A paper describes a structure:
To obtain high-resolution maps of activated and inactivated particles, TLP from cells infected with rotavirus in the presence of trypsin (TR-TLP), or in its absence in medium supplemented with the protease inhibitor leupeptin (NTR-TLP), were purified by density gradient ultracentrifugation and characterized by SDS-PAGE. Three-dimensional reconstructions (3DR) of NTR- and TR-TLP were computed using SPA with imposition of icosahedral symmetry, achieving resolutions of 3.40 Å and 3.48 Å for NTR- and TR-TLP, respectively. While the density of the VP2, VP6 and VP7 shells exhibited a homogeneous high local resolution, the spike showed a radial decrease in resolution as it extended away from the outer shell surface, with particularly low resolution in the body and head regions. In addition, although the VP4-C lectin domain was detected, it was observed with low density, which has been associated with flexibility. The resulting maps provided sufficient quality to support full atomic modelling in the foot and stalk domains, while in the body and head regions, a combination of backbone tracing and rigid-body fitting was applied (representative examples of model-to-map fitting for each region are shown in S8 Fig).
The infectivity of rotavirus (RV), the leading cause of childhood diarrhea, hinges on the activation of viral particles through the proteolysis of the spike protein by trypsin-like proteases in the host intestinal lumen. The external layer is formed by trimers of the VP7 glycoprotein in phase with the underlaying VP6 shell and 60 trimeric VP4 spikes, which project from the VP7 layer, that clamps them and partially covers their base. This outer layer is responsible for the first steps of RV infection: attachment to cell surface receptors, lipid bilayer penetration, and release of the double-layered particle (DLP) into the cytosol, where transcription of the viral genome is initiated.
Residue numbers in the entry:
A (entry chain d): 57 to 314
B (entry chain c): 51 to 324
C (entry chain e): 57 to 326
D (entry chain n): 50 to 326
E (entry chain D), F (entry chain C): 134 to 397
G (entry chain N): 266 to 397
Amino acid sequence: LPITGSMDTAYANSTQEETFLTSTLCLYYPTEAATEINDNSWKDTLSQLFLTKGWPTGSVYFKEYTNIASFSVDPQLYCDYNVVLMKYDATLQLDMSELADLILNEWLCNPMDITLYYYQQTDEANKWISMGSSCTIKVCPLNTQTLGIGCLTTDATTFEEVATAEKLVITDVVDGVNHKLDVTTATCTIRNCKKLGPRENVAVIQVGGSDILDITADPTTAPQTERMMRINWKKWWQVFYTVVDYVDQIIQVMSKRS
Amino acid sequence: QNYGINLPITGSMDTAYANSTQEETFLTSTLCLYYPTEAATEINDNSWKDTLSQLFLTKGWPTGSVYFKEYTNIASFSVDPQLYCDYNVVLMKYDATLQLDMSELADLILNEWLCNPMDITLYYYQQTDEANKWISMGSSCTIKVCPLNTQTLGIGCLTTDATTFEEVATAEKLVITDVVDGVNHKLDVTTATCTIRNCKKLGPRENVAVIQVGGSDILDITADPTTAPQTERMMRINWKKWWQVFYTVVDYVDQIIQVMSKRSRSLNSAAFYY
Amino acid sequence: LPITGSMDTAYANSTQEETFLTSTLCLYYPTEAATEINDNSWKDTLSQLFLTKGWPTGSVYFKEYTNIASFSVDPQLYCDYNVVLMKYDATLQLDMSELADLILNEWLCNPMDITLYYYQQTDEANKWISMGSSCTIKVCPLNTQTLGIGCLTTDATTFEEVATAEKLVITDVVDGVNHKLDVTTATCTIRNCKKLGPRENVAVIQVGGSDILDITADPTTAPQTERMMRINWKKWWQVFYTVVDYVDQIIQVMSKRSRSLNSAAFYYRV
Amino acid sequence: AQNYGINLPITGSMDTAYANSTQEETFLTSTLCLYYPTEAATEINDNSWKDTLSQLFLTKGWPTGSVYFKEYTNIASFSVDPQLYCDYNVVLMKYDATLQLDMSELADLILNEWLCNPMDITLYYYQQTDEANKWISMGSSCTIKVCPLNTQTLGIGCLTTDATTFEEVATAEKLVITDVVDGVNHKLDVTTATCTIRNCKKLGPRENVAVIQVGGSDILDITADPTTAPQTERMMRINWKKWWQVFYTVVDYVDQIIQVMSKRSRSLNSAAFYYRV
Amino acid sequence: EYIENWNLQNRRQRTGFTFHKPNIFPYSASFTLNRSQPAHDNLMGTMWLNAGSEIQVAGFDYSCAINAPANIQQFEHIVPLRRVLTTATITLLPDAERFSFPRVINSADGATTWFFNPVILRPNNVEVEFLLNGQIINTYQARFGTIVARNFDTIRLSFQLMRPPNMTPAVAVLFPNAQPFEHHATVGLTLRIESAVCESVLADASETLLANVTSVRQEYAIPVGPVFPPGMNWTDLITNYSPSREDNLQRVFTVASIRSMLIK
Amino acid sequence: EYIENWNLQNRRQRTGFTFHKPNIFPYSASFTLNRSQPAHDNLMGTMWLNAGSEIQVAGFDYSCAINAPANIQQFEHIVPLRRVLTTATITLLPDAERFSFPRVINSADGATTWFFNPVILRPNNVEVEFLLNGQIINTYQARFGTIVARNFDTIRLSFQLMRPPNMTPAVAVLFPNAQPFEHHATVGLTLRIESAVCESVLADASETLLANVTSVRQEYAIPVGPVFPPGMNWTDLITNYSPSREDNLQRVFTVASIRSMLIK
Amino acid sequence: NGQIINTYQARFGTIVARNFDTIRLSFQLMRPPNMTPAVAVLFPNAQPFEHHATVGLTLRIESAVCESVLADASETLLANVTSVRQEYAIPVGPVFPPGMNWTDLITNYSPSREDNLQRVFTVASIRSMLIK
Ligand SMILES: CC(=O)N[C@@H]1[C@@H](O)[C@H](O)[C@@H](CO)O[C@H]1O
Ligand SMILES: CC(=O)N[C@@H]1[C@@H](O)[C@H](O)[C@@H](CO)O[C@H]1O
Ligand SMILES: CC(=O)N[C@@H]1[C@@H](O)[C@H](O)[C@@H](CO)O[C@H]1O
Ligand SMILES: [Ca+2]
Ligand SMILES: [Ca+2]
Ligand SMILES: [Ca+2]
Ligand SMILES: [Ca+2]
Ligand SMILES: [Ca+2]
Ligand SMILES: [Ca+2]
Ligand SMILES: [Ca+2]
Ligand SMILES: [Ca+2]
Ligand SMILES: [Zn+2]
């Protein structure tokens, strides 16, 4: 479906005010934020501050999460625009990369039955995304004869584990090689998801720290897009007010879900 | 406009690239930089200033044009804006806890700030655009802000007492408060030890060259989360001994000064008080 | 000799197969990887995974080190394409940059004499590289009168100390100033070296952390070059599998090394 | 709205019509500050004389919050750090007869734009480049001792190691403006604990401030040059019996005192990149 | 020449007006997005400038054919003419110069703007065809410089973008496999009709007859009639070049040639 | 044509020389900074190339009118001619191609150099006016392609840069509200006189008469006289095109036309 | 045409200029190195200058031959043209300035205005022969 258009037609007027009157955004803040916030009616306070900047009174919602590990199991992102106040912890170096790999990208996905079948990467694009309370992936490769490469197929201890006790795992093993894996499937579900592209209805605001997000899979690219932002954070109220002030720029680097 | 500001200049695109004036740049002007007290503690020489000043005298500068000024930490350096000489380079040591404070120091020093003082017990205040901020300096002041309704009632607080006010700054030297631009705000600033004022950001002070000694890049010297532009004069090196750092500065002064310009020197300080 | 190529010439076929089948590949990992892997013949397992990607049956070599300090005492980069996998430490903030300086750049190096002669630096291209078990370098400037400024020529306590207890130092100091040295000669070996260009068969893979590596000691530039990658780790198996299956994009960011040296070290060539 | 550091030649016609009065808009827009000694507010005997004056300034044209009142104890303590803030400044100072260099150095700071560099006395020997270079020191107690060197770094009449062989140009003074011979490298002995000295260059006059000498004769020598003692437009003097006559005179003649000064030439947006503060 | 072609067309014989750079193309600067989305970060399609005697076309892909079959993306640009040109010398160059620098462009509905940061590959497999009534008269496969087109009324440019299979490390950082493409692959052609023989009247860069007609119609403040466009807009005159407008244009150009003989 | 215009101007009647791409513009490649500072990081003003028959102009703003009133910055470029052109066909295109790629440019005094990294917006509200003695003869408002200008000696181009009110996330990262602008907004026009009738003699891309005059004056090593520029510099000849130099140029061009009839 | 036809270096009195259309005056102010005490009080090194240094020239074209028509102090032809146009209350036409402003006529002295001015001055010379 080719979409053509002239290169001297008029610029339409700023449809930012209509986007404010129509859309529905929601920020996801951690629980220790709500500990430092110390208010019972700060939700109405902030939502009236959003009312000052054009958003109507039923357009802004405030949802919580406990930490990055607890938010990593099923983030829903049901609003029109989404920003997450992803708080930097220096001990968890790859967890933020996992969460931003999940939320910022479109994952067309399929399920995975571990007992029946064997699995592999069709190209670079798909990964083994596993979610649950405790994911202990154990992958062993197989050759073209379905013999164990460096393991025994009936021994689960000679398997070569790539993650343990982790909420959200995005597993990468070699492309063209057949594999058999072991999951404690009672507490974790794995499925192979290709990334089609990016999610334009979500943004990440890294609260403190440094630019660490290697949301791509390979080491060869670590690009920083427009919706991966970073603040410096002495107190929380400064950066709640920063989001409420510069919502006209944050919505500008995002797009509607449809 | 009595310096020819409304009048346009007309270049010619084909002037012969007349001369090179790097040596006249390095002759009558002054270059002074700020180093922490822990630097001169690990240096532990009584006359290392003589050693370095002779090494600056190698690199084109005359002798009486390089000054050394201490500071205790980034908090005790930010108790007042002091930018002394013609060419300035500032040497901060990275600390992971002192995270916003380095960005606050670079936000004051790198940019130009036209400022008017604020009267918090009498009047109400707001911010006009992105450039308006509330810079507050002092020994220790807790800033408790509360927004206001359009009929002067407190949004989620009570303007009669100070407990229900919302704090944005607890016992810090130099705050750049950013609030929402629409509503008015009732303020609780401990003015016995503090001085708060509103300040517009301008075209930035083109001289001061921030040299981050250690760490990674952290300096979000803007307000929005959208942009963190690492401009020309925010450099960063790594340290094991300070002598390597000072030798690096003396060696690459030819590269550092060509990244700044002395034409943006103010008169006394770094606050442009009206 | 100037080459004069046309613009409308046809693109040749993809020669990554002829690059895989007629070259080698070394992977360097710290021994913490070897104690977290916990397998006897995982070099066989990993090399059979490389065999799927077109690399031949024994054309991928594995060589170990303990830490960044003990690898920088002599980085002997053996084979035709060298990836090094370097674990991030916040305390090893500059020494990781020292090792990434030494293995990602071409240097011309001759030995130096300290007791007899003393040396200066010509421009920003030459620096003073010193390797050994412990390099405590204490340097003092001089002048046309060859008297020490801010120090004493005889007294070694009055010297200006740039590095202590360090395996690999790259001392930068000012140009056109005569400098007298104090290096522990019986342990540390020092050389001055001119930076010609980039050593180009090396991918440093910062395994964890943040991008810090300021190679060019000029503060005005911090060149994040193409062969300086950063992966974040939880288990090493993730890192090794990522290096195996993105191997074409990691040989693609390298080129053939183009410099005729004279030292004639060992090479793992096909 | 551009070309901030170029110094372009203007071209104005000599047949342009004269603009309108502009004085009412200057009174509505800008701000005024009045600095008075504390002996005034002693003899005034009021707490609300500020509001009485401010309503008389309202009669003259200024708004209520446009006229600011600050005070000082004596000329010596005002001269510790004179930081003069607002758009139009005028200072009242009484002629103490025994201090005459103090008022002249005070008006030498206040009525001139000073571009000043720092100093380090322990390191460097300092020479003055030309006449507009002065050495301005301020603090609690300045005691400056100068040692003239020859061209070989050997002191002329002063041992470079001894400090008692040095000769003092001022002792125990708050602000000192030191002029020495130009071209000779000098060693200093400023008491750096209670005094900071700075390498200053007189760019020109300061355009926003006048000085009213309340009582006492014409003494003001701005330019540290014996041949010229300039009497500019903003070195006014009046005679006093009570202070109320002085305050009613400065309130009656606002339209002359604001007239003989202007807006500060540096503080405009047009002087953006020529030393703006 | 004009009175000769007047007398030959008054007896219905074949005529030919020889033009140097004829204004056969109406001004049409536009584009086409074969692959698009409201994010405008992965686009694919052609852009063109048809002006005077010059076609500058450029097909761009943001992915640089990283998921296209055989890493080859086929572009195509078909320009129909209004009158049949005959014996045309045409300068065909690669690498269209106007669509080779970064620009921001309004969308199709004019709502939002999108950014275009091109890097230029050479055009692989250029096929320039000169169609008359749908039949291929002349064809040129990967031949640049001066070409000839003997009889045509449609110009079909078929160039394709091929991803380079061998890339140095300076090139491999430009085109990742992932989504953020800060450098967009762009392939262009330029086609300039230097001289052509057309049976109908036109305007070109050599004669001044259209200038004389517009000068007479604008000097005496003439109302807009039934045939010619308001203000003698040549773009609107060659956009809808009807045979009645053709007859009026030929008559008025012949009279303009007569007056240009007498009045200088 | 030359002996006809010789005989008509010997009796003081109106003449016209028909030129294909006349060299009416002297070579003037320069710029103008309406807003500038020694940092050269927030600049505003026009750049132009006047060469032969072609004007390429481009007004740039580094802020992209982020503080201009109504987000619109007005540019203007006035080109005075030396002789009055008559009945000129002019190709007016947007998006000046020469001032659309990054370059470093010396300053006005030639002291320092400044960097220019353009991204191209389309020209909003183009007004091209053709002035004769200060009176607007022809005007064209947002019309590109081929235009006509019947009688003029001054060309006034009035284009403006409007900040786009709706921007995708690929565009919104280019133009921040703060100071560091790594991508500078630039808006251009191109104006090419294809053919024109001028009463005075000129040079153009069709005749070779100036080439014959310079070949005769350079072949026989002729000293520089009182009228013509040294080396027959056409830029210095059309920069100061006095009527005595006009008479000498017309006489020598007429004799060159005579010799070009005989000697090939 | 940008070429120096005549030049005169520190020569006053009557000079001659054979062919020109631009006059370039290049004078300079030199501070006197030796000054009596009556002069040295005028020019201090400091800022208040109550006496300002000023250097002038005067250039008066007494007579000249011009190819185009002009007005001068000898003829009365412009006066006759303006007297006829002002006596009979004539509306402002397309060429000449309103009220026959000679400053606005020589400011923008176009060749069509030159032709009109020469024709009307020739007719004014004819009428000045007949009518006194
Ligand atoms: C331009 C447009 O899109 N429509 C309206 C227009 O009718 C109105 O005149 C203009 C005022 O600036 O505001 C626009 O929203
Ligand atoms: C099947 C076939 O024709 N093979 C050719 C091969 O000969 C050529 O060397 C190569 C270059 O990459 O292109 C292939 O298509
Ligand atoms: C608005 C303005 O300033 N102009 C007025 C002018 O209209 C008036 O005729 C004149 C009378 O003297 O006074 C000026 O101030
Ligand atoms: Ca195993
Ligand atoms: Ca894979
Ligand atoms: Ca509250
Ligand atoms: Ca704000
Ligand atoms: Ca020492
Ligand atoms: Ca060096
Ligand atoms: Ca003595
Ligand atoms: Ca002196
Ligand atoms: Zn042509």
